[PDB]
Amino acid sequence: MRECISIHVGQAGVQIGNACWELYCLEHGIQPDGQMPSDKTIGGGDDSFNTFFSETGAGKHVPRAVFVDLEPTVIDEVRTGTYRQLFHPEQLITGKEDAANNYARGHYTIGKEIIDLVLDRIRKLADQCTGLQGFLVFHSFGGGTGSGFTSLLMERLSVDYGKKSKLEFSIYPAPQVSTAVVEPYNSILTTHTTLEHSDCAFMVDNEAIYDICRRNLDIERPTYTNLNRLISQIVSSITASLRFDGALNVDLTEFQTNLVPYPRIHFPLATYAPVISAEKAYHEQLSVAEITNACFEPANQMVKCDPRHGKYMACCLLYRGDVVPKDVNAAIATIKTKRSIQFVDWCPTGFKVGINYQPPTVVPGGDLAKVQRAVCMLSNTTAIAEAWARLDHKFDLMYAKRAFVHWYVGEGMEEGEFSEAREDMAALEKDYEEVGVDSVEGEGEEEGEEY
Amino acid sequence: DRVQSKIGSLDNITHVPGGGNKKIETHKLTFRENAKAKTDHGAEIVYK
Amino acid sequence: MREIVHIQAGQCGNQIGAKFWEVISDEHGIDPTGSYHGDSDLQLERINVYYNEAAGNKYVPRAILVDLEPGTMDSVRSGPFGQIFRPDNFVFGQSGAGNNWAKGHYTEGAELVDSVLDVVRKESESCDCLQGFQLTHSLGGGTGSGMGTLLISKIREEYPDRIMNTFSVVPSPKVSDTVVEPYNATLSVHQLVENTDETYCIDNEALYDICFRTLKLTTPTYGDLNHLVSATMSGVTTCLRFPGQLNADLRKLAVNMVPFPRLHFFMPGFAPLTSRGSQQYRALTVPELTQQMFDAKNMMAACDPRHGRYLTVAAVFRGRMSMKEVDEQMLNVQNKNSSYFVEWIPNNVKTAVCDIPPRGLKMSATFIGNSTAIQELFKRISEQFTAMFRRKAFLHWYTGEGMDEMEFTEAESNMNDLVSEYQQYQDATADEQGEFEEEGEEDEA
Numbered sequence: 037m038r039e040c041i042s043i044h045v046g047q048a049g050v051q052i053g054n055a056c057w058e059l060y061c062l063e064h065g066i067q068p069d070g071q072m073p074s075d076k077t078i079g080g081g082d083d084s085f086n087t088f089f090s091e092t093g094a095g096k097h098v099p100r101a102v103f104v105d106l107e108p109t110v111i112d113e114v115r116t117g118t119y120r121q122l123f124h125p126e127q128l129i130t131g132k133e134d135a136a137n138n139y140a141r142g143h144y145t146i147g148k149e150i151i152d153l154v155l156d157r158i159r160k161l162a163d164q165c166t167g168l169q170g171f172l173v174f175h176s177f178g179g180g181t182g183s184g185f186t187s188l189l190m191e192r193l194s195v196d197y198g199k200k201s202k203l204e205f206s207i208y209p210a211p212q213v214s215t216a217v218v219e220p221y222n223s224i225l226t227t228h229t230t231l232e233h234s235d236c237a238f239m240v241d242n243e244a245i246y247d248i249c250r251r252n253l254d255i256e257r258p259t260y261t262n263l264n265r266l267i268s269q270i271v272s273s274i275t276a277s278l279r280f281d282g283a284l285n286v287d288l289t290e291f292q293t294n295l296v297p298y299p300r301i302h303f304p305l306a307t308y309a310p311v312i313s314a315e316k317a318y319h320e321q322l323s324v325a326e327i328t329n330a331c332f333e334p335a336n337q338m339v340k341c342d343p344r345h346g347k348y349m350a351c352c353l354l355y356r357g358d359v360v361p362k363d364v365n366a367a368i369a370t371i372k373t374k375r376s377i378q379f380v381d382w383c384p385t386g387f388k389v390g391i392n393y394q395p396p397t398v399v400p401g402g403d404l405a406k407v408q409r410a411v412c413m414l415s416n417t418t419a420i421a422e423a424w425a426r427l428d429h430k431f432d433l434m435y436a437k438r439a440f441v442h443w444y445v446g447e448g449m450e451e452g453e454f455s456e457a458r459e460d461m462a463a464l465e466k467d468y469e470e471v472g473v474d475s476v477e478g479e480g481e482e483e484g485e486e487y
Numbered sequence: 488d489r490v491q492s493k494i495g496s497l498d499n500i501t502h503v504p505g506g507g508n509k510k511i512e513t514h515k516l517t518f519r520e521n522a523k524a525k526t527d528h529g530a531e532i533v534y535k
Numbered sequence: 536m537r538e539i540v541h542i543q544a545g546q547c548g549n550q551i552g553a554k555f556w557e558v559i560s561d562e563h564g565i566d567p568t569g570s571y572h573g574d575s576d577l578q579l580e581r582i583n584v585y586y587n588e589a590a591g592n593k594y595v596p597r598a599i600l601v602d603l604e605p606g607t608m609d610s611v612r613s614g615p616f617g618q619i620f621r622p623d624n625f626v627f628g629q630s631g632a633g634n635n636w637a638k639g640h641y642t643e644g645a646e647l648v649d650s651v652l653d654v655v656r657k658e659s660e661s662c663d664c665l666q667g668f669q670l671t672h673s674l675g676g677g678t679g680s681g682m683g684t685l686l687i688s689k690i691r692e693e694y695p696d697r698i699m700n701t702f703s704v705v706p707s708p709k710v711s712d713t714v715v716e717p718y719n720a721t722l723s724v725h726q727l728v729e730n731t732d733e734t735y736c737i738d739n740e741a742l743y744d745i746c747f748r749t750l751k752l753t754t755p756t757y758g759d760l761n762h763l764v765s766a767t768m769s770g771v772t773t774c775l776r777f778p779g780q781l782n783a784d785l786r787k788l789a790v791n792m793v794p795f796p797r798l799h800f801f802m803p804g805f806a807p808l809t810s811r812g813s814q815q816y817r818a819l820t821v822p823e824l825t826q827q828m829f830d831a832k833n834m835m836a837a838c839d840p841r842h843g844r845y846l847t848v849a850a851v852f853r854g855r856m857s858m859k860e861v862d863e864q865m866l867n868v869q870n871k872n873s874s875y876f877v878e879w880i881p882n883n884v885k886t887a888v889c890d891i892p893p894r895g896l897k898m899s900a901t902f903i904g905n906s907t908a909i910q911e912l913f914k915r916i917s918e919q920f921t922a923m924f925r926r927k928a929f930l931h932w933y934t935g936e937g938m939d940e941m942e943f944t945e946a947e948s949n950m951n952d953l954v955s956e957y958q959q960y961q962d963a964t965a966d967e968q969g970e971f972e973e974e975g976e977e978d979e980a
């Protein structure tokens with residue numbers, strides 16, 4: 037009756053895709069072959085799972101999603117992993133040679149060979165929608181597939197789907213940690229392109245979730261397979277209304293009505309709570325306000341730019357499992373009474389809210405906490421300015437020295453493009469400062485009387 | 488252009504409060520600045 | 536005989552709606568599949584007020600059930616009593632609103648509108664004297680709030696001497712569940728204030744403090760807040776369905792509630808509100824109803840009405856009881872709390888009394904007030920609208936479904952007038968002077 041698309045680009049996308057689809061299978065009772073031999077149901081039809089899976093004539097479900105990197109290897113891994121028979125063969129799309137962390141391979145000289153073969157697979161998934169709602173697209177800024185091709189695809193989706201929601205889910209660059217030397221060309225060449233083609237663009241940070249993993253999941257060895265499993269708890273909580281019925285449902289196209297005050301201000305940061313080990317879970321009763329207050333702690337953010345350096349301005353705040361709207365009401369109001377938690381004076385309406393009856397699942401891989409109720413949150417803030425303040429000067433240093441620019445140019449670009457991208461990123465620098473303005477009073481100004 | 492912000496952050500700052508309006512009151516109130524002829528009132532004794 | 540249609544639209548409107556058609560279904564012995572098997576023949580005897588009569592002695596509500604998504608209509612039909620409703624009345628769209636009132640009013644809700652009117656005609660050409668139309672909807676939300684504005688506007692143009700009533704979920708003093716609620720609210724007030732006969736303002740913050748502090752529910756759910764709204768809908772519409780000492784319909788409330796066709800937004804209340812241990816240690820009388828019903832916590836919107844003045848009140852009491860006693864207590868409130876009321880209105884209260892109490896109660900009272908104290912709520916909407924609009928914030932979604940940016944000020948000037956209009960009639964006395972003369976001036980100082 038309603039449907040959406042998920043899309044997984046570059047080696048960051050394809051892997052956060054596994055965690056998500058691992059979960060969604062497990063959450064819905066769908067197996068690694070696409071079956072659901074799982075609940076002795078007597079009624080059916082929604083079954084809101086159909087929004088994310090296509091049903092087959094003999095009861096197999098198939099994921100409404102598409103994979104891409106520009107070499108096979110990371111995809112051959114899924115293709116031969118436990119979900120080989122789960123995922124649709126022709127939705128698993130592959131190049132030969134990877135984009136090398138070079139945006140110009142991803143957007144321009146390689147990208148151009150497989151873009152229409154992705155778009156063909158995607159028009160052929162809209163013909164399975166009964167009403168295409170939108171798109172949820174997973175990448176990183178540091179990969180050159182993850183930057184170049186995600187922004188090629190957003191060029192192309194913003195025509196073929198020009199009204200629908202294009203929602204991004206980035207691994208965003210850490211403050212002190214990096215995964216490419218060419219990290220700044222990618223971050224800015226993708227952000228400058230999507231800055232007119234995407235609806236929302238949510239951030240998670242590996243430097244931030246490592247410390248959550250050592251601190252509060254109490255894990256010594258946080259792998260990317262563990263960390264992508266923690267990131268998956270935010271994605272399942274953000275989609276809960278489109279997965280299950282609830283006291284207070286939210287639409288795919290509601291987040292941006294509430295979170296994006298001006299169309300360029302589309303960087304809400306993401307989070308989950310409560311993050312515990314099983315042994316800690318026993319020393320917390322976890323009432324709704326405890327989760328809520330914890331979820332607001334700066335050291336509990338899944339982006340490492342500190343909210344102590346900025347005002348908050350727009351939130352969406354989402355609850356799962358055993359939850360009473362009266363507790364949500366009070367715990368929200370508790371956080372506002374604590375205006376110590378700094379927020380913009382000119383949006384006291386700073387929250388949207390959603391409450392879903394279905395509790396979370398953990399993907400087993402340790403001792404299990406006995407969870408009852410949970411919280412996830414999206415927040416727009418000027419701490420994102422604190423993050424970008426360096427990535428910006430890194431682009432200034434790289435570009436002033438013309439370091440690496442002959443790889444990108446050779447593979448489909450001109451220096452004037454590096455200038456425009458940075459120029460708009462200098463406009464965007466002033467945009468997150470304009471939303472930091474404590475505005476002047478307008479009361480008590482008059483003309484005097486005519487005689 | 489040496490670069491500037493692109494968001495409409497203060498586009499309505501020329502407008503002012505409020506928070507009340509009018510009020511409608513007995514001292515006039517239906518009139519306009521050009522409704523000519525049709526002299527007051529009242530017959531030629533009050534006066535013409 | 537005297538028929539009303541009910542409309543339910545967006546998520547709070549359909550949820551409140553499935554307490555209404557659970558509560559009233561049960562108040563009437565309606566079965567969860569539309570059979571009747573009830574225990575007093577009085578129940579069956581004014582059934583057409585709210586119902587159709589369908590073949591094999593089956594019964595169908597005049598429920599119309601509307602949405603821009605497909606899920607609440609699954610969750611109501613899978614839900615209790617979901618088989619009493621007619622399938623041809625489940626007109627939900629394919630887009631949501633996503634809290635955008637303009638996705639409601641200009642684009643997607645404007646796309647459903649002809650298909651919603653198709654069932655509004657069916658049902659109304661099948662009445663014998665339609666009085667009115669009741670809408671449970673949002674105000675700071677979008678799916679209800681933005682449908683509800685356009686729906687009332689076309690109904691007002693097809694049906695202009697029929698009554699127009701609205702159960703609106705109002706933005707609360709501490710929390711928002713939607714960010715564009717000031718936008719959603721101001722815009723709505725402009726559109727409704729020309730076409731409603733009645734709007735109820737109903738606050739989840741005001742019902743939480745009831746539910747948690749006076750009913751002692753350890754866990755106040757929306758299911759339990761919606762039980763209170765449906766008790767309210769049931770309560771103000773009792774005399775249409777049953778015998779009583781003083782019977783009053785919605786047109787008989789309207790004329791006592793509405794001094795000027797602008798001044799028709801109201802606060803409701805129910806009594807008794809009592810916890811389960813307290814039910815032993817309390818005694819129910821018409822004075823008990825009376826005391827509790829003018830009490831500052833009993834008010835279902837977030838004001839102490841001692842901040843302003845009552846213009847008009849209505850009280851709708853159910854059960855067997857002395858008309859002396861209820862006049863008496865109403866006189867006592869008007870004379871021992873006489874300053875709670877405005878004085879350029881005399882004798883300020885309608886009362887009506889029905890012989891049939893709520894199925895779970897011995898006796899009950901339902902209040903409706905018009906007061907200059909609730910302007911603080913519209914002041915709050917006006918300032919919190921200003922905190923977004925003075926900065927052009929969120930405006931790009933409304934303009935993207937193609938509303939004009941000027942219309943924001945048209946609604947805002949209207950609100951700023953309306954909030955001034957309740958304020959200018961607050962303790963609006965006559966004032967008088969005496970003429971004065973002098974003696975002659977003299978040389979002596």
Ligand SMILES: Nc1nc2c(ncn2[C@@H]2O[C@H](COP(=O)(O)OP(=O)(O)OP(=O)(O)O)[C@@H](O)[C@H]2O)c(=O)[nH]1
Nearest residue numbers: 046047048134135136137176178179180181182260
């Ligand atoms: N959290 C997380 N991030 C990952 C993961 N895999 C890759 N990344 C991120 O993605 C990038 C590393 O993968 P890449 O090999 O650059 O991905 P790519 O886009 O295929 O690269 P090219 O196509 O060769 O440009 C960095 O920005 C990483 O931080 C993963 O499993 N977990």
Ligand SMILES: Nc1nc2c(ncn2[C@@H]2O[C@H](COP(=O)(O)OP(=O)(O)O)[C@@H](O)[C@H]2O)c(=O)[nH]1
Nearest residue numbers: 545546547550634673676677678679712757760
């Ligand atoms: N009392 C009550 N409030 C509700 C219920 N459902 C939603 N709400 C609240 O009603 C308001 C509007 O919600 P909703 O109807 O979801 O908005 P919309 O779909 O955008 O029109 C917010 O304050 C919601 O929290 C419900 O069952 N009962």
Ligand SMILES: [Mg+2]
Nearest residue numbers: 105106134181
């Ligand atoms: Mg790659």
